[PDB]
Amino acid sequence: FRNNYDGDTVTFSPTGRLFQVEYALEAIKQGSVTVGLRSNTHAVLVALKRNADELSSYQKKIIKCDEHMGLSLAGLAPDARVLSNYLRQQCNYSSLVFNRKLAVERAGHLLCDKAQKNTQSYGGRPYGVGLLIIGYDKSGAHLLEFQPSGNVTELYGTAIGARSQGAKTYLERTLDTFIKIDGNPDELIKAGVEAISQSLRDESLTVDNLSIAIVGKDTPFTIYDGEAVAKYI
Template sequence: MMDRRGDDAGYDRSLTMFSPEGRLYQVEYALEAVRRGTLCIGLKSKAGAAIITRKRFTKLMDTSTIQKIFRMDEHIGCAIAGLHADSRILVDYARVQCQVHRLTYNEPVRVPTITRKLADIKQQYTQHGGVRPFGSALLIIGVDPDGTPRVMTTSPSGTFSGWKGTTMGANSEDARTKLNEELNDEMSIDDIIKLGIKILKDSTDEDFEDTSLQIAVVTSEEKLFKVLSQEEVKKYL
């Protein structure tokens, strides 16, 4: 893909140059980095929202140093797909913006508000020379101050969307199809977690253990984002 020939050759050397087809190849390369990431599943019901994903590591790695899920605020968190370093910078930015909102308005930030701020900063990195797009997508879950559960995503291009359930990373299309068939609004938190684990297993070629599985939840009643411990994850497995 990097070795281009013909009319579109060379258009991937500059971030701000469109190809004759109207494409920005550097942004497409960032999207490809996301597609090669491990599968993440985000889903919600009236009871709340959950993220189910898995960490990829080798036997010699310390698994406690690998994070796929991050907390942004008391009621908001996210899973990442793509380049971890880029994702970490975006998460730090989101944490600051959440606190700025609290100090300015004396209330928790809404999930669509912080998602839009992240999408805006990503879009800025697609229109300036001397920088490159963030090779990272974020799957964000949370509960708004009015008790509305949210599942939202941002892409390297700066687009953002809200979902009842979605996936990102490797094999995301197959997993999204299965999610569309089985998810409904009346499911409990336990039900959506079990559904997410089932779809993750069915859509992953490799066998995985409880040490690689990560689950985070936020309920409509408590409005607190929580990453489950390994003991809690084992119960669901």
């Protein structure tokens, strides 16, 4: 492995792949684990926070954009702050110029244009942090999954992080459950708790480890930290 063919960002592999995209993709799988889901009138985002010491705090994995939308990061933390600045800039751009809130569908296309410029030009690098875009508009709740290459696909729910792909088993069997649940935000939050619990091995969910942010029609985006999520454990 290491650098043979695609070590230069402008080089293509003989197998038709890109190792630089694969290198940054593996950064998400080795990062912090997070899950998510959504319903017709609501969307639930659950993230797990870790650290290197018990005395140390837990860096927030959920970044707020506006009142109607939010996101989460799995990967290198400072790389998501740069992408979050471009997303929040488009939220205020459409608010000042177009007097409208940034739609989730249009936010994925604008976010894809930022990552494709660094991959197609030497001197830059793709962001190795994932972004799960949640929000609500007149159409409904939408969830997106960001990759280091910039692929954007709308999903009911997914998970990115350490042992996150194995936690999708609970989301597949319950896929027909939470999509039909409307007006019950408490049950939708508890659905994401059982999904992330499948990836727990060493430590379980605690007060400071559990971070849940829900968004909906009548309820704006709100980050619940500390003892706010203690009742949903």
